[PDB]
Amino acid sequence: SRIGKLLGFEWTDLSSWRRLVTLLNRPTDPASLAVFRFLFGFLMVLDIPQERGLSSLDRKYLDGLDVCRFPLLDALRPLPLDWMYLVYTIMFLGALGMMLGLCYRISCVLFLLPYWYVFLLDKTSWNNHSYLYGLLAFQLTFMDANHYWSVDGLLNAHRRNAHVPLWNYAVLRGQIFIVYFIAGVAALDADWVEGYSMEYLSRHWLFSPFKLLLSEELTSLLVVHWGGLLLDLSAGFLLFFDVSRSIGLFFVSYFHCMNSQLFSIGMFSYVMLASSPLFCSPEWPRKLVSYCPRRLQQLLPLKAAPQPSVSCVYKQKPGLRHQLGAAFTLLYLLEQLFLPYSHFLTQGYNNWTNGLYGYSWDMMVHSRSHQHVKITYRDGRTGELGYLNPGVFTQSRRWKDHADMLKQYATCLSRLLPKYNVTEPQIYFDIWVSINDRFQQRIFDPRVDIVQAAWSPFQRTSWVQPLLMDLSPWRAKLQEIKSSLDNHTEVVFIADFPGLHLENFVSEDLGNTSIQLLQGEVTVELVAEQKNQTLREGEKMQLPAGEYHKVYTTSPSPSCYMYVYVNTTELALEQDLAYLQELKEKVENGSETGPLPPELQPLLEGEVKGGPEPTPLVQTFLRRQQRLQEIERRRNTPFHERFFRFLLRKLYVFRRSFLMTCISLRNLILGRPSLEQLAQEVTYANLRPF
Amino acid sequence: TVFLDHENANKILNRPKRYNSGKLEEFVQ
Numbered sequence A: 001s002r003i004g005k006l007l008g009f010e011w012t013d014l015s016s017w018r019r020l021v022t023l024l025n026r027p028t029d030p031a032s033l034a035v036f037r038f039l040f041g042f043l044m045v046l047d048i049p050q051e052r053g054l055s056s057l058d059r060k061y062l063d064g065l066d067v068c069r070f071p072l073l074d075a076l077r078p079l080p081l082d083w084m085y086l087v088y089t090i091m092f093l094g095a096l097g098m099m100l101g102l103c104y105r106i107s108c109v110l111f112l113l114p115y116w117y118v119f120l121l122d123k124t125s126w127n128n129h130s131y132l133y134g135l136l137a138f139q140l141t142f143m144d145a146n147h148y149w150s151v152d153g154l155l156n157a158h159r160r161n162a163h164v165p166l167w168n169y170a171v172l173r174g175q176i177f178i179v180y181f182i183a184g185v186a187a188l189d190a191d192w193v194e195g196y197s198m199e200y201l202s203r204h205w206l207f208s209p210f211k212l213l214l215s216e217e218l219t220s221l222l223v224v225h226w227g228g229l230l231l232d233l234s235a236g237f238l239l240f241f242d243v244s245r246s247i248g249l250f251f252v253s254y255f256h257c258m259n260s261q262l263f264s265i266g267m268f269s270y271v272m273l274a275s276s277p278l279f280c281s282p283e284w285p286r287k288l289v290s291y292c293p294r295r296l297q298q299l300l301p302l303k304a305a306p307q308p309s310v311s312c313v314y315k316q317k318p319g320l321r322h323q324l325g326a327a328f329t330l331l332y333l334l335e336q337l338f339l340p341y342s343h344f345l346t347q348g349y350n351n352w353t354n355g356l357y358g359y360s361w362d363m364m365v366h367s368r369s370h371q372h373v374k375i376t377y378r379d380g381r382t383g384e385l386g387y388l389n390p391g392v393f394t395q396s397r398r399w400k401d402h403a404d405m406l407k408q409y410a411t412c413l414s415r416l417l418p419k420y421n422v423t424e425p426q427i428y429f430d431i432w433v434s435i436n437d438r439f440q441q442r443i444f445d446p447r448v449d450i451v452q453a454a455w456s457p458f459q460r461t462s463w464v465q466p467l468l469m470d471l472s473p474w475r476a477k478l479q480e481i482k483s484s485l486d487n488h489t490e491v492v493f494i495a496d497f498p499g500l501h502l503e504n505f506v507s508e509d510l511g512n513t514s515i516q517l518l519q520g521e522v523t524v525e526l527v528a529e530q531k532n533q534t535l536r537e538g539e540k541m542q543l544p545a546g547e548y549h550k551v552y553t554t555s556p557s558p559s560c561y562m563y564v565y566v567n568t569t570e571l572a573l574e575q576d577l578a579y580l581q582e583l584k585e586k587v588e589n590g591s592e593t594g595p596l597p598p599e600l601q602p603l604l605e606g607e608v609k610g611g612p613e614p615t616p617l618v619q620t621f622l623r624r625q626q627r628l629q630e631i632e633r634r635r636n637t638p639f640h641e642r643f644f645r646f647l648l649r650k651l652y653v654f655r656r657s658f659l660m661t662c663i664s665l666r667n668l669i670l671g672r673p674s675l676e677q678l679a680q681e682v683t684y685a686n687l688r689p690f
Numbered sequence B: 001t002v003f004l005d006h007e008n009a010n011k012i013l014n015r016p017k018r019y020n021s022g023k024l025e026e027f028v029q
């Protein structure tokens, strides 16, 4: 029938459970499943020393170090450094076995268990492509991916060129479609459609051909934003149908190739590229081998027809294995569709977006900008106030946007502080964030002690400041102001809630600073003079430099205002430097016949030898000139040199990871050697290549 | 510098080192 030739099955196959099980276990060619299996394992091997964190294990998990960590479960803790190296060694071996097909099921488990343990250890390392790797490994554990091109085929005669169940391809194809489609739906947000996210991505040289027929603004809006949205929503349908597969393959290949150079996402683009041929005929690799010379065929996988396999149902009564496989493909695909939209039961992980980042397929939709962070503590006994350096005991900055991470950070601080003579501290946070070029605003209540604050996984957090969505239309006006400013002027846009105030200390270098009111009403107090002045819409007031001032939001609705300032110290210094350069040019061109000043002598000589120490202005000028020369030298570098340096950097990363693992494995098995011996070995492992 | 002082803590108009916007999807060294 027409439907049978289009979808690959018929309505009769869904009539009963037995028919459904029979259809899902239909024998299929394993050539395509094997090629993807090899490619996935090869890329996993490459990724382990680069992004999984093998080359920085000693720095991250240093023994006897004070660090605040963010595990999903508070009871999950890492192992000592030597045992952490063993975990990565087992993960590496499992990936190698998967790529080769040697002891397929054991190798799959060896990769899977260590991978998820490391993933759950750090919530700050979660992203969409790392989440996908764990999903792909989980699926392949139950698949017969070692039936065509693997070592297991040589070890066992029954696993050499054998059929595989159809649900092996259905689950993999369904997973890839979900990644495309859910991403396209998430890209339906107003910010994406209007072109606010990644509004500067069209300046890359890779977009040169488009600019020959479009403007910069038009190219960004149509190509980058609407083009990406269209591909996500139609990539799955294009690949599935064979009348449009050729067009889809070219479009997705171009889409992924560009992304590999526009962003730094590790192996994401290469994994997606490899998954594309999974929609083609399951025997495409075998057909390609058929077009090879007879001599070359002796070094390639078999080309004959696959042999029957017990995993499939042949036109018999299905057994337990077939029924379980049918159940898995239905339940697993159902769970994948639901989870990205489950952010209504776990209400404790929503602050401004939905849930933790990593399992919603929302790539590059929201961009954040942080302006300032302040951490305050008050001693429980003494009662004195103090301030901490933001992110003092952290290895990442993601704690600023999540209430679950902030609660962990505050608990960690209260445990460490007593060792610095602080007893029973109370900690407050003041973080200013802006999302997609909006007004800068607070994200948490600055009057709440987070140590004693209440947090639950299933309850909405009480001390999270709502996002001011009503002020979004101001973005057009904000850009207009920022485009009319002078080359030496800067502006900051702030919105504050009623009943709150902002305390600001203006640096001495920021001469000529002023504040103007855009909406609402505020009161500005000069702390030193104890003077209060009220402001009205469109009113601007000058502020002193090197002093304190406070802004009170007295309106019943949030107020908006902007800061305009100029760095006077830098401006004067640059003018002096420019004047010196003009004088030097006058000397060089033959003018200024008069004797050069003693300070100008170092400029001509370029080396301070046998003379008085040069003034800071001369040193600054020399440093700037040297920096410009280095920049010019870096630009004038042939492509061959650039590629060679790139390969050398990779070689050092791979070599260091191997040597550090050997040292740790030696300690575990034989025993720790003398300190002098250990110091020498670490020095050897830190040597650069070549 | 674990401990700060009043002037540095409240200095809002300071050169932000993390001026560039982040995506949360890009790998960081």
Ligand SMILES: *[C@@H]1O[C@H](CO)[C@@H](O[C@@H]2O[C@H](CO)[C@@H](O[C@@H]3O[C@H](CO)[C@@H](O)[C@H](O)[C@@H]3O)[C@H](O)[C@H]2NC(C)=O)[C@H](O)[C@H]1NC(C)=O
Pocket (backbone or CB within 6 Å): A484, A485, A486, A488, A489, A512, A564, A565, A566
């Ligand atoms: C402190 O810095 C601000 C911002 O740079 C200075 O404001 C600038 O003031 C000058 C006049 O003194 C403005 O120039 C005049 O404004 C019109 C407006 O249309 C403009 O077309 C011309 O340039 C005109 O001469 C200038 O525009 C304005 N800055 C900006 C970016 O608009 C201010 O003067 C500084 N204060 C001190 C004491 O130096």
Ligand SMILES: *[C@@H]1O[C@H](CO)[C@@H](O[C@@H]2O[C@H](CO)[C@@H](O[C@@H]3O[C@H](CO)[C@@H](O)[C@H](O)[C@@H]3O)[C@H](O)[C@H]2NC(C)=O)[C@H](O)[C@H]1NC(C)=O
Pocket (backbone or CB within 6 Å): A507, A509, A510, A567, A569, A570, A571, A573, B013, B014, B015
């Ligand atoms: C206004 O301009 C002055 C320069 O005229 C700025 O001072 C400079 O600030 C930068 C950081 O923004 C300093 O760079 C960093 O500081 C450390 C510690 O001093 C130094 O080791 C390195 O240079 C480091 O990169 C810089 O040293 C400092 N001074 C100079 C002479 O450049 C000032 O920050 C500006 N003020 C504002 C609020 O924009």
Ligand SMILES: CC(C)=CCC/C(C)=C/CC/C(C)=C/CC/C(C)=C/Cc1c(C)c(O)c2ccccc2c1O
Pocket (backbone or CB within 6 Å): A183, A198, A223, A224, A225, A227, A228, A231, A232, A254, A255, A258, A259, A263, A265, A268, A269, A272, A363, A364
């Ligand atoms: C061929 C012609 C005439 C026009 C083509 C017109 C076309 C398709 C331009 C495309 C270039 C362009 C503007 C690419 C950035 C768009 C963005 C931000 C996609 C978001 C995104 C990103 C960043 C990823 O890393 C992904 C990785 C794996 C899977 C999905 C991913 C994904 O969805």
Ligand SMILES: *[C@@H]1O[C@H](CO)[C@@H](O[C@@H]2O[C@H](CO)[C@@H](O)[C@H](O)[C@H]2NC(C)=O)[C@H](O)[C@H]1NC(C)=O
Pocket (backbone or CB within 6 Å): A499, A500, A501, A523, A525, A530, A531, A532, A552
């Ligand atoms: C200037 O006016 C502000 C208006 O807010 C005063 O700030 C208030 O001070 C009183 C105590 O005098 C507090 O009870 C309020 O809570 C403060 N306002 C807030 C935080 O909304 C400020 O004291 C005045 N300054 C001077 C020097 O008189």
Ligand SMILES: CC(C)CCC[C@@H](C)[C@H]1CC[C@H]2[C@@H]3CC=C4C[C@@H](O)CC[C@]4(C)[C@H]3CC[C@]12C
Pocket (backbone or CB within 6 Å): A112, A113, A116, A117, A118, A120, A134, A135, A138, A339
């Ligand atoms: C002590 C621990 C870390 C070691 C054992 C790892 C366990 C917990 C791993 C192995 C397989 C994993 C599961 C594999 C696949 C999925 C589907 C995904 O959509 C949600 C997570 C979930 C449900 C994983 C949860 C964690 C998991 C059960």
